[PDB]
Amino acid sequence: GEFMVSLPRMVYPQPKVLTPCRKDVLVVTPWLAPIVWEGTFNIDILNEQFRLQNTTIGLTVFAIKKYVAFLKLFLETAEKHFMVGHRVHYYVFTDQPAAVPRVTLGTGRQLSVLEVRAYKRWQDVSMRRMEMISDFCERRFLSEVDYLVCVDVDMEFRDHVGVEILTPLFGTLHPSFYGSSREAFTYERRPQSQAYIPKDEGDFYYMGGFFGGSVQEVQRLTRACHQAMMVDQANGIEAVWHDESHLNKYLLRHKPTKVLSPEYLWDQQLLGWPAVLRKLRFTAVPKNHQV
Amino acid sequence: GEFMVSLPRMVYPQPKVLTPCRKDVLVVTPWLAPIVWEGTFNIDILNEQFRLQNTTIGLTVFAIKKYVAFLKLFLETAEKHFMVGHRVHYYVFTDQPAAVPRVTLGTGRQLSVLEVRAYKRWQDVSMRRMEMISDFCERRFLSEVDYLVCVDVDMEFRDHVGVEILTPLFGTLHPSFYGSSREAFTYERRPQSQAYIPKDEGDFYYMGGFFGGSVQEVQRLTRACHQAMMVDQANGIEAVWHDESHLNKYLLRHKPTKVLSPEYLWDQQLLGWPAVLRKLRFTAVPKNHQV
Ligand SMILES: O=c1ccn([C@@H]2O[C@H](COP(=O)(O)OP(=O)(O)O[C@H]3O[C@H](CO)[C@H](O)[C@H](O)[C@H]3O)[C@@H](O)[C@H]2O)c(=O)[nH]1
Ligand SMILES: O=c1ccn([C@@H]2O[C@H](COP(=O)(O)OP(=O)(O)O[C@H]3O[C@H](CO)[C@H](O)[C@H](O)[C@H]3O)[C@@H](O)[C@H]2O)c(=O)[nH]1
Numbered sequence: 384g385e386f387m388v389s390l391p392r393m394v395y396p397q398p399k400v401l402t403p404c405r406k407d408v409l410v411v412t413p414w415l416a417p418i419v420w421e422g423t424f425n426i427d428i429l430n431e432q433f434r435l436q437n438t439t440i441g442l443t444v445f446a447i448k449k450y451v452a453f454l455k456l457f458l459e460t461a462e463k464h465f466m467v468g469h470r471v472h473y474y475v476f477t478d479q480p481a482a483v484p485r486v487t488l489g490t491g492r493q494l495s496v497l498e499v500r501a502y503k504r505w506q507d508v509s510m511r512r513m514e515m516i517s518d519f520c521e522r523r524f525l526s527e528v529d530y531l532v533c534v535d536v537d538m539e540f541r542d543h544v545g546v547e548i549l550t551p552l553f554g555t556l557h558p559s560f561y562g563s564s565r566e567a568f569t570y571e572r573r574p575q576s577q578a579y580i581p582k583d584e585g586d587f588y589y590m591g592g593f594f595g596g597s598v599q600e601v602q603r604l605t606r607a608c609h610q611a612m613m614v615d616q617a618n619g620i621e622a623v624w625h626d627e628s629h630l631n632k633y634l635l636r637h638k639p640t641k642v643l644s645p646e647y648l649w650d651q652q653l654l655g656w657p658a659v660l661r662k663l664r665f666t667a668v669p670k671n672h673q674v
Numbered sequence: 675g676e677f678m679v680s681l682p683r684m685v686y687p688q689p690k691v692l693t694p695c696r697k698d699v700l701v702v703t704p705w706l707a708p709i710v711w712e713g714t715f716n717i718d719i720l721n722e723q724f725r726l727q728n729t730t731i732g733l734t735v736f737a738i739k740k741y742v743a744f745l746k747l748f749l750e751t752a753e754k755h756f757m758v759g760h761r762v763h764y765y766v767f768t769d770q771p772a773a774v775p776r777v778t779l780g781t782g783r784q785l786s787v788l789e790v791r792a793y794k795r796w797q798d799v800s801m802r803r804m805e806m807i808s809d810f811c812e813r814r815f816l817s818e819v820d821y822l823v824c825v826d827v828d829m830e831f832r833d834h835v836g837v838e839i840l841t842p843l844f845g846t847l848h849p850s851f852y853g854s855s856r857e858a859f860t861y862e863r864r865p866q867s868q869a870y871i872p873k874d875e876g877d878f879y880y881m882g883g884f885f886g887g888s889v890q891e892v893q894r895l896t897r898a899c900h901q902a903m904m905v906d907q908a909n910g911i912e913a914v915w916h917d918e919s920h921l922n923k924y925l926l927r928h929k930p931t932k933v934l935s936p937e938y939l940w941d942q943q944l945l946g947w948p949a950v951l952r953k954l955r956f957t958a959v960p961k962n963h964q965v
């Protein structure tokens with residue numbers, strides 16, 4: 384939120400008030416947050432706005448135990464598609480620093496390897512990211528980046544993922560549930576859990592694999608989710624979908640300022656390529672669950 | 675931007691991703707700013723969000739010379755429709771403090787009468803609002819309100835105008851031009867003016883009668899428009915639409931974070947009640963121009 388200088392002259396098509404960009408999908412939430420789909424944004428305008436602020440984006444990714452194998456494709460495709468032209472700082476959290484592949488980066492981009500402990504259960508590995516993002520890295524992130532983007536590693540970039548996502552707080556629509564009614568969402572349904580959401584509440588089902596925002600908002604979210612997980616652990620309960628359950632509770636009670644469409648987290652294997660998706664931007668890589 | 679506590683449990687209809695709110699109009703700009711139309715927002719959610727921040731809204735209005743006659747209806751209808759339930763501070767700028775009508779206010783609402791000089795030409799009266807809002811009232815507004823809303827007085831509220839409009843910076847689509855191509859917009863077209871916009875630039879034509887934002891953003895806008903008007907005056911040129919021309923230049927170069935639809939500034943006399951308007955919220959009162 385620093386003083387913003389004027390945009391230069393730009394030549395682009397006039398937005399027309401009586402022509403929607405997209406008529407097939409919801410492009411704004413009932414709390415007036417944009418839902419980001421292809422056709423809703425002019426990337427040239429957004430790139431100008433964010434470049435004029437010299438925006439730095441941090442990207443966090445965890446690669447613990449066998450998941451180090453996903454890093455090469457993840458990082459090489461991020462170089463092709465993630466925030467190209469902007470300052471990027473990758474933060475790779477791993478138990479095997481020597482297994483991080485040497486990936487060639489474009490100018491203005493850097494990578495830090497952060498060693499962490501590996502936990503036995505994949506559920507605990509997934510869940511402990513909230514603590515790792517918040518408690519350990521609070522001060523570093525505040526000094527080094529403007530926004531944090533927190534993603535799964537078992538993924539590849541296939542198309543543009545850029546500054547259109549940046550906002551104080553965002554979540555991403557889970558690709559399996561964007562057409563589902565709220566009663567069908569796999570929220571935590573046990574009232575004994577901090578993640579509990581009743582059947583008559585819920586806006587969306589957000590996937591735990593892609594969330595972000597300003598550093599302050601991300602530290603708030605990760606701190607709250609970590610605290611809620613600790614309460615659950617003390618009470619002998621583990622939410623049905625782990626960190627994702629808590630993320631969903633948080634974003635129900637603290638509405639995101641943008642929502643990313645499932646373009647931003649897709650599984651083509653599983654779900655194909657429906658008409659509503661004009662681009663598949665960030666997609667699941669096969670993982671043979673029982674990695 | 676203070677710490678935001680959690681929303682309470684709320685029961686409301688689920689937003690459905692594959693059902694747009696409105697298919698007849700553009701509801702988001704190409705820079706991802708919501709365009710505020712009826713059907714795009716859930717006021718209960720927004721009221722909760724803004725009440726939890728104890729939001730105070732300042733409303734500025736100028737009533738100089740014969741325009742004091744418009745104050746009674748303006749203020750009485752604002753009491754019925756403007757930010758009801760929230761803290762409101764009216765700032766009435768006038769050359770005739772004794773002519774301000776005694777209007778009964780709801781709880782949490784206050785009115786201040788600010789005496790100013792009357793200028794001879796209606797164009798100068800209109801134009802000098804930018805200076806009056808910025809230079810004179812900078813410190814007061816920063817201490818007293820969170821958002822400023824700056825409107826014409828020759829108007830009445832007929833329907834809800836609430837926290838859905840609040841954002842760092844907003845303008846309102848001029849009711850005569852929302853369907854027009856940019857070449858038809860009455861921007862200042864002389865390159866000798868600071869307000870100059872070429873025929874191949876422009877997003878929208880914003881009306882000078884309804885704009886606002888955070889206090890900081892409004893002071894930035896009003897300061898920039900005042901400075902630009904002073905440059906024009908020194909160069910012997912007066913923009914075709916005065917302050918409105920400068921407002922349009924500013925919002926071209928500094929994109930608003932929400933845009934209000936013409937629901938928010940309408941003239942039923944002149945334009946009727948088209949199908950695209952589900953509500954007429956803030957409307958022109960007859961003024962017999964040659965007042
Ligand atoms: O042995 C492991 C297990 C997990 N992870 C990390 O944890 C992430 C999440 O695990 P998976 O990708 O195996 O799980 P899913 O793809 O099923 O994940 C979805 O469900 C999870 C909760 O069960 C999380 O919320 C996750 O973010 C969401 O995308 C991985 O991408 C990886 O970054 C590891 O590094 N090593
Ligand atoms: O003698 C006057 C003349 C003007 N005004 C103030 O200036 C405002 C703007 O003047 P008008 O309402 O007469 O002009 P329009 O309705 O045609 O205004 C439109 O065009 C103007 C520029 O020409 C401004 O930009 C204005 O905000 C925009 O709504 C008035 O509402 C009032 O608040 C007075 O108080 N007294």
Ligand SMILES: [Mn+2]
Pocket residue numbers: 535536537592
């Ligand atoms: Mn995954």
Ligand SMILES: [Mn+2]
Pocket residue numbers: 826827828883
């Ligand atoms: Mn007017």
